[PDB]
């Protein structure tokens, strides 16, 4: 719920949205109305190999809960993913920081890992001086 996120998602185009559109399909695996609830949200996040807290499941949605329905949609999730990208970069943040690049392999598959390994590099120093 910040400008840094809304500003990022705003830049995203159909090309990028398309990738997310397919993700939701798997993310809502089991859901009745193809929605992302806390029940599944916890399995999808833990599927990557994490053991976060139960409260986080709700807090995560609360952040993107505008309609106050209690579920994350394609539009809501759009903002969530934006935060993910700016979650690992921060560094030092609890023992579970979901990432858009990491979660990808979860939906796309294991091949996604071998396909791209940019995360491994991790570098960003302009060095002005
Ligand atoms: Ca909702």
Swiss-Prot record:
Cellular component, GO annotation: cardiac Troponin complex; cytosol; sarcomere; troponin complex
Molecular function (Gene Ontology), one example: calcium ion binding
Statement: the UniProt record of this protein carries the keyword Repeat: yes
Record-annotated EF-hand domain positions: 16-51, 52-87
Positions with a binding annotation for Ca(2+) 1: 65, 67, 69, 71, 76
Signal peptide: none
GO biological process: cardiac muscle contraction; diaphragm contraction; muscle filament sliding; regulation of ATP-dependent activity; regulation of muscle contraction; regulation of muscle filament sliding speed; response to metal ion; skeletal muscle contraction
Keyword Phosphoprotein assigned: yes
Family statement drawn from the similarity comment of this UniProt entry: Belongs to the troponin C family.
Function comment: Troponin is the central regulatory protein of striated muscle contraction. Tn consists of three components: Tn-I which is the inhibitor of actomyosin ATPase, Tn-T which contains the binding site for tropomyosin and Tn-C. The binding of calcium to Tn-C abolishes the inhibitory action of Tn on actin filaments.
Misc note: Cardiac muscle Tn-C can bind 3 calcium ions per molecule. Domain I does not bind calcium.
Associated disorder: Cardiomyopathy, dilated, 1Z: A disorder characterized by ventricular dilation and impaired systolic function, resulting in congestive heart failure and arrhythmia. Patients are at risk of premature death.
Protein name: Troponin C, slow skeletal and cardiac muscles
Organism: Homo sapiens (Human)
Lineage: Eukaryota, Metazoa, Chordata, Craniata, Vertebrata
Record gene name: TNNC1
Full-sequence range covered: 2 to 91 of 161
């Amino acid at each position: 719920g910040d400008d840094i996120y809304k500003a990022a998602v705003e830049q995203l185009t159909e090309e990028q949205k398309n990738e997310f559109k397919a993700a939701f399909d798997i993310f809502v695996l089991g859901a009745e109305d193809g929605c992302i609830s806390t029940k599944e949200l916890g399995k999808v996040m833990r599927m990557l190999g994490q053991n976060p807290t139960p409260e986080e499941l709700q807090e995560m949605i609360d952040e993107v809960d505008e309609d106050g329905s209690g579920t994350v949609d394609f539009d809501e999730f759009l903002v969530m993913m934006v935060r993910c990208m700016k979650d690992d970069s921060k560094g030092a943040g609890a023992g579970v920081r979901i990432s858009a690049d990491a979660m990808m392999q979860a939906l796309l598959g294991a091949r996604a890992k071998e396909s791209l390994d940019l995360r491994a590099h991790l570098k960003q120093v302009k060095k002005e001086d």
